[PDB]
Design an enzyme around this catalytic site. Structure first.
Site, short mmCIF file in Angstrom:
data_model
loop_
_atom_site.label_atom_id
_atom_site.label_comp_id
_atom_site.label_asym_id
_atom_site.label_seq_id
_atom_site.Cartn_x
_atom_site.Cartn_y
_atom_site.Cartn_z
NE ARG B 255 -2.85 2.37 3.37
CZ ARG B 255 -3.77 3.26 3.02
NH1 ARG B 255 -4.54 3.07 1.96
NH2 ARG B 255 -3.93 4.36 3.75
CD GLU B 357 -5.92 13.61 13.76
OE1 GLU B 357 -7.14 13.84 13.87
OE2 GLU B 357 -5.47 12.59 13.20
CG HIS B 360 -9.14 15.70 10.59
ND1 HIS B 360 -9.74 15.56 9.36
CD2 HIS B 360 -8.28 14.66 10.71
CE1 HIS B 360 -9.24 14.50 8.75
NE2 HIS B 360 -8.35 13.94 9.55
CG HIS B 487 -8.74 0.12 4.51
ND1 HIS B 487 -7.37 -0.01 4.46
CD2 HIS B 487 -8.98 1.27 5.17
CE1 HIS B 487 -6.81 1.01 5.06
NE2 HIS B 487 -7.76 1.81 5.51
CE1 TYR B 497 -7.41 6.15 3.68
CE2 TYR B 497 -7.79 4.05 2.60
CZ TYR B 497 -7.79 4.83 3.74
OH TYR B 497 -8.17 4.29 4.95
#
Ligand SMILES: *[C@@H]1O[C@H](CO)[C@@H](O[C@@H]2O[C@H](CO)[C@@H](O)[C@H](O)[C@H]2NC(C)=O)[C@H](O)[C@H]1NC(C)=O
Ligand SMILES: *[C@@H]1O[C@H](CO)[C@@H](O[C@@H]2O[C@H](CO)[C@@H](O)[C@H](O)[C@H]2NC(C)=O)[C@H](O)[C@H]1NC(C)=O
Ligand SMILES: *[C@@H]1O[C@H](CO)[C@@H](O)[C@H](O)[C@H]1NC(C)=O
Ligand SMILES: *[C@@H]1O[C@H](CO)[C@@H](O)[C@H](O)[C@H]1NC(C)=O
Ligand SMILES: *[C@@H]1O[C@H](CO)[C@@H](O)[C@H](O)[C@H]1NC(C)=O
Ligand SMILES: *[C@@H]1O[C@H](CO)[C@@H](O)[C@H](O)[C@H]1NC(C)=O
EC number: 3.4.17.23
Lengths: 49, 595
Positions: B255, B357, B360, B487, B497
């Site tokens: 990945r 974050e 976010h 996933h 993604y």
């Protein structure tokens, strides 16, 4: 224990108070007093944390 | 009197009780995540149960309002979100079997232990040990043993489970008026009813293909360079004309390629831009790291952090007696409560992750005014993109020299730029063909294009054709090789993604042309530019109320996915890779010539 009115048929006049707990009839069918679909109690609670 | 006013009043009732019950559920989940104790477990279970019960009864009452006679887009979007039947549309036996299948896939993946034959006294789990060996070791047969053993065991124990899973999910999607489960997953990007900004469920696949076709030259050059360096690492096993061996990609599945920075370094003599030493010398605690992130966000024009954020967030590991989940997570409790669960340490990494974050949390704060069921990103890609752009901007040499982590006399030559862009390429460009291949395989297996007895043969072929990675040994249908990933085994969408990767560089170009940056894109910083923060904030406040195409037009001036910012970001690295691939062969062959 702190409540507010969320649903009312018409707007309030200045310096007026409504203490009614009548089930707000939002649809076409009569509510009949019991809470149910399209029939909401107008006084909602202020869940303070 | 009409249906629309009934919908408005029902949505007002639902929004009020939803915000209250959601706050209780989120507070119980927070109390479990920061304090792993059995009473917190049962509190979280009771709150989650009451939330799922509420959202069930309210969806039952919500499906009595047909959507075709509602003209307001916000009410239509909220009712479309609420009326989804999920797994409830099936019979009770099939729904119970589906939940049982999902639970047993979760328990097999979480508690999957695979170890060496002839040494069974203790064995190794995936999360503590397999990531280490597959990401740090340089031994070919050891990585081969771990890779083949884990895929063999997990595939044999998961293949009939996936066989029933695809059928049950296909029945769930087809009962919910979708073509297949792939269409159900692609429905997150669907926009209907807005003129000019319309986006179909079926258009996503060709859009992804059209972007990937321009991704392919850069990826091919990167692949060739990586192949050459791995040939330096492993002399005889890899072929000049063939693909990469599957167990040499630095991860368990291939990945990310970020674990190959040590082997594939352009200039090993030059140092990196690691600023951990400057933080530990100047005693930068976690609080001041978050304060510097706040200073960046007030420099760009966005709001400050709330008082309750500083009071209630746990920005440091609490200790050994009190156990907490160490995963970095941004929490939107609601009722104006925003928190960050992060076991912050002193590192350059945790600094960038704190910026991510806080991006976010800023995204969650901007859309708070919106109704409850529209308090999300416009699609699944925007939420992580708006944090990754902050992670992009904060890691620049200019930003590190502005805040004192990097010396003012630091010389930014082209070699450290090549190094940075190659690390970013191994992290970003490496995951794109794997993501596109996995999602396209899942779409075709849900669609029925791939026959039931031809799964592995098709998958490996695509890995040869798309990713340019060859299998070590042939695998028959007794194995379930895709299902070894987190996933896909736990019912998660994977195209987020790819979309996030494209939206990241699109947002980055829009903000950098907004902030008047006169150099290459990778050197750009959005600090002190309020017009760029305003341009971004015009998209953040919307939430899910507007289409994602409209939000994209608000930021980048285009309504569709574009691949030009990504290739423009990696342009000097593209020229460098073109320069040093003269001797080698760019591109791969689908033959099994390496192994
Ligand atoms: C979600 O499930 C409910 C329950 O089956 C569906 O409601 C039924 O819809 C059919 C088709 O319109 C009607 O003939 C039934 O009378 C409905 N039953 C009830 C109790 O309302 C609902 O349509 C489903 N919604 C979606 C989007 O799939
Ligand atoms: C953004 O603006 C701040 C505030 O004006 C800049 O910080 C100043 O930088 C100059 C550099 O010549 C210093 O002399 C000042 O002492 C700094 N002031 C403060 C309060 O820090 C900052 O450099 C600007 N640019 C960026 C990228 O942040
Ligand atoms: C964590 O849970 C334990 C369980 O009793 C409790 O004593 C402790 O006070 C909790 N910690 C916090 C910070 O609430
Ligand atoms: C949709 O309803 C909201 C309130 O629920 C209102 O603010 C908005 O103006 C409405 N939009 C249209 C186009 O009527
Ligand atoms: C909040 O932001 C303003 C500028 O918009 C700044 O002047 C103020 O100091 C900030 N608040 C705190 C507590 O730093
Ligand atoms: C960096 O720039 C110098 C000066 O133009 C040049 O000689 C050198 O080849 C460049 N290196 C790279 C990797 O681009």
């Amino acid at each position: 224990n702190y409540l507010y009115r969320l649903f009312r048929k018409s707007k309030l006049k200045p310096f007026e108070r409504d203490i009614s707990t009548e089930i707000y009839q939002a649809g076409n069918k009569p509510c009949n007093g019991v809470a149910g679909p399209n029939c909401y109690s107008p006084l909602q609670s202020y869940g303070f944390r | 009197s009409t249906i629309e006013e009934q919908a408005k009043t029902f949505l007002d009732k639902f929004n009020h009780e939803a915000e209250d019950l959601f706050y209780q559920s989120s507070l119980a989940s927070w109390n479990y995540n920061t304090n792993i104790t059995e009473e917190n477990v049962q509190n979280m279970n009771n709150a989650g149960d009451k939330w799922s019960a509420f959202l069930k009864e309210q969806s039952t009452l919500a499906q009595m309002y047909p959507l075709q006679e509602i003209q307001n887009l916000t009410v239509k979007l909220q009712l479309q979100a609420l009326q989804q039947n999920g797994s409830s549309v099936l019979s009770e036996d099939k729904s119970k079997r589906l939940n049982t299948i999902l639970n047993t896939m979760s328990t097999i993946y979480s508690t999957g232990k695979v170890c060496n034959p002839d040494n069974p006294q203790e064995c190794l789990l995936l999360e503590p040990g397999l990531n280490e060996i597959m990401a740090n070791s340089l031994d070919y047969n050891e990585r081969l043993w771990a890779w083949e053993s884990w895929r063999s065991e997990v595939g044999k124990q998961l293949r009939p489970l996936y066989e029933e899973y695809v059928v049950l999910k296909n029945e769930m999607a087809r009962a919910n008026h979708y073509e297949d489960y792939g269409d159900y997953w692609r429905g997150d990007y669907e926009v209907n009813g807005v003129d000019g900004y319309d986006y179909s469920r079926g258009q996503l696949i060709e859009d992804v293909e059209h972007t990937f076709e321009e991704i392919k030259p850069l990826y091919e050059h990167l692949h060739a360079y990586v192949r050459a360096k791995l040939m330096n690492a492993y002399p005889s096993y890899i072929s000049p004309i063939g693909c990469l061996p599957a167990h040499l990609l630095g991860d368990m599945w291939g990945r990310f390629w970020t674990n190959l920075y040590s082997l594939t370094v352009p200039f090993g003599q030059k140092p990196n831009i690691d600023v951990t030493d400057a933080m530990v010398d100047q005693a930068w605690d976690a609080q001041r790291i978050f304060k510097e992130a706040e200073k960046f966000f007030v420099s760009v024009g966005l709001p400050n952090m709330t008082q309750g954020f500083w009071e209630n967030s746990m920005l440091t590991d609490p200790g050994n007696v009190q156990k907490a989940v160490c995963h970095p997570t941004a929490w939107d409790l609601g009722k104006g409560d925003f928190r960050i669960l992060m076991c912050t340490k002193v590192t350059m990494d945790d600094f960038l992750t704190a910026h991510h974050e806080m991006g976010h949390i800023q995204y969650d704060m901007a859309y708070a005014a919106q109704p409850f069921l529209l308090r999300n990103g416009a699609n699944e890609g925007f939420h992580e993109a708006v944090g990754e752009i902050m992670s992009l901007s904060a890691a620049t040499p200019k930003h590190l020299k502005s805040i004192g982590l990097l010396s003012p006399d630091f010389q930014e030559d082209n070699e450290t730029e090549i190094n940075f862009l190659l690390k970013q390429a191994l992290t970003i460009v490496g995951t794109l063909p794997f993501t596109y291949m996995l999602e396209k395989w899942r779409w075709m297996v849900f669609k029925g294009e791939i026959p039931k007895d031809q799964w592995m043969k098709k998958w490996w072929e695509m890995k040869r054709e798309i990713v340019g990675v060859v299998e070590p040994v042939p695998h028959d249908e007794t194995y379930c090789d895709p299902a070894s990933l987190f996933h896909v085994s736990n019912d998660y969408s994977f195209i987020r993604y790819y979309t996030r990767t494209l939206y990241q560089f699109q947002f980055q170009e829009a903000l950098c042309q907004a902030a008047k940056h006169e150099g290459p894109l990778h050197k750009c910083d959005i600090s002190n530019s309020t017009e760029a923060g305003q341009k971004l904030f015009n998209m953040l406040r919307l939430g899910k109320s507007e289409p994602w195409t409209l939000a994209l037009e608000n930021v980048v001036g285009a309504k569709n996915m574009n691949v030009r910012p990504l290739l423009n970001y990696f342009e000097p690295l593209f020229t460098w890779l073109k320069d040093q691939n003269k001797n080698s062969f760019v591109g791969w062959s689908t033959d099994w010539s390496p192994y």
